[PDB]
């Protein structure tokens, strides 16, 4: 069952083993139960840690209900996949990914004062192809000022660094003007909407670009796995797959009392049930009660 | 889908588009009788004007029924399509059973015949291993968990290089 | 037996969700 804090995340999500648990919880509440006390505790590190480890339990089955658009004609199945992942991030408690990684940027370098360590401490979160170019243009403005560039904003060296890194950003191909005018806003709602109708266009191009990069990586990895697999004779393939399946089955059956092991074994029995149900009536598929 | 929809018996489709099934409706004042004719089947119903808005009160919410996962089914679909692409070029192999007669055996250099019979055994090996379709269910499970860990990011599942680059421009070019 | 249910069949089967639940159950009381 659930422990009164996992069930507060599973309300808006639509994955099956969360929806059936929420439905059994409401079956408990309608049939004469009181709601347990929500904890007014757990100081901020434990709060964001349990957010990190509780949104994981609602995102990780959400990826498996999302089918990859591997090798399809048109960029619109990539838009389907990225929209599904956006909806999964929305139902997982994450924000828009732009403002989410902006929040991570602010969280990472709250204690950085110069601009070289703001490019050092956010090395894991930005592209190294872009981090190398930003470090080299910062070494250029460092050769200009002959002083460490300060990460304050009102410094003239940082102003020249901003006017050079905007050219670096257009050199990467992404327009910094529509993005800065989006997050800086305008007076009237009409010239804010005219900026948003460019920023959302770039935003769609950006998320479909990295989603298409992801499905191209899975396409090439599946092609490499198949081409390393087709070079084997069939008895070696059957022995390797049966031995790997038996070993990872022994790894589950060894864990006695573990909940994940019991769920693993029940899903194995459900897979065998699916094989039996397609074996009984293969004209229509599995037997589903309706 | 939203809970309130706004469609039905207004800008509705008026007729058929295929030769497999026929349909024509009755656009009367208050009511509507459909007449759908499909070969050996015949159906003519009488529906009301508000009988189409009560249709979308309950939602269907169609869902997949997958053996392992919908993601695993998509990866197994791509492995089946790649096995189709390899099977299309094991289908253009030249027929070598026509050169098994003994009038090709004894006119041949012996090592060339050794090479030819070993090439035939190699083709039978390649064809037995490209049509092992039971093994795609365990080939797909080696692509799954690294992908599922990549989508289990600490910032956002749909995150990528370009959106992080754009937000780094937004973080850097503003006043700290 | 056969023809079990619909939401019992909609479950993404070999997703983790429980190993993460195991580590989140044995981590948070050990860190509070």
């Amino acid at each position: 069952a659930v422990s009164k804090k996992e069930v507060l995340y599973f309300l808006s999500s639509k994955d099956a083993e969360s929806s059936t648990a929420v439905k059994s919880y409401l079956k408990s509440l309608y049939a004469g139960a009181q709601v347990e006390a929500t904890e007014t505790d757990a100081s901020e590190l434990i709060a964001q840690l349990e957010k990190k480890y509780l949104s994981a339990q609602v995102v990780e089955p959400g990826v498996h209900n999302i089918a990859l658009p591997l090798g399809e004609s048109g960029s619109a199945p990539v838009k389907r996949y990225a929209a599904e992942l956006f909806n999964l991030g929305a139902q997982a408690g994450f924000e828009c990914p732009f403002i989410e990684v902006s929040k991570k940027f602010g969280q990472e370098t709250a204690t950085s004062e110069t601009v070289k360590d703001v490019l050092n401490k956010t090395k894991s979160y930005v592209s190294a192809d872009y981090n190398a170019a930003l470090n080299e243009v910062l070494s250029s403005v460092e050769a200009e000022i002959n002083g460490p560039v300060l990460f304050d904003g009102k410094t003239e060296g940082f102003k020249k660094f901003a006017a050079k890194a905007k050219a670096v950003a257009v050199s990467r191909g992404l327009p910094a003007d529509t993005i800065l005018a989006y997050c800086a806003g305008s007076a009237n709602e009409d010239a804010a909407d005219k900026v948003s109708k460019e920023f959302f266009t770039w935003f769609e191009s950006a998320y479909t670009a990295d989603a298409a990069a992801e499905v191209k990586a899975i396409e090439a990895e599946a092609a490499s796995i198949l081409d390393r697999h087709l070079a084997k004779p069939v008895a070696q393939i059957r022995k390797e797959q049966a031995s790997a399946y038996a070993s990872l089955l022994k790894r589950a059956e060894t864990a006695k009392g573990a909940k994940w092991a019991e769920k693993y074994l029940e899903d194995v029995k459900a897979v065998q049930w699916f094989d039996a149900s397609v074996a009984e009536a293969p004209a229509s598929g599995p037997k589903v009660a309706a | 889908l939203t809970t309130f929809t706004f469609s039905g018996l207004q800008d509705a489709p008026v007729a058929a588009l295929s030769g497999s099934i026929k349909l024509n409706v009755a656009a009367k004042a208050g009511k509507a009788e459909v007449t759908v004719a499909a070969g050996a089947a015949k159906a003519a119903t009488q529906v009301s004007a508000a009988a189409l808005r009560k249709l979308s009160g309950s939602k269907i919410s169609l869902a997949e029924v997958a053996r392992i996962s919908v993601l695993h089914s998509s990866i197994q679909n791509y492995l089946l399509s790649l096995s189709n692409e390899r099977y299309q070029l094991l289908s253009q192999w030249p027929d070598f059973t026509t050169m098994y007669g003994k009038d090709f055996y004894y006119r041949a250099h012996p090592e060339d015949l050794k090479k030819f019979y070993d090439a035939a055994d190699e083709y039978y090996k390649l064809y037995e291993t490209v049509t092992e379709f039971d093994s795609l269910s365990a080939l797909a499970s080696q692509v799954v968990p690294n992908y599922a860990a990549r989508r289990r990011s600490t910032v956002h599942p749909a995150i990528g290089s370009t959106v992080a680059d754009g937000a780094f421009t937004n973080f850097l070019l503003s006043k700290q | 037996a056969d023809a079990k249910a619909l939401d019992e069949l909609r479950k993404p089967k070999f997703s983790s969700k429980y190993l993460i639940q195991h580590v989140s159950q044995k981590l948070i009381p050990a860190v509070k």
């Binding site: 990872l248 | 070029l89 968990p145 990011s153 600490t154 | 580590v23």
Partner: peptide, 30 residues
């Protein structure tokens, strides 16, 4: 068909490492 279960996070946002194209089509045409 069953995969090993992992519970770990990726904090890095990198390119997804598009792997090498293997030479099976050219070997089979050869």
């Amino acid at each position: 068909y069953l995969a090993p279960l992992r519970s770990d996070f990726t904090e890095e946002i990198t390119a997804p490492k598009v792997a090498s194209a293997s030479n099976l089509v050219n070997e089979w045409n050869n």
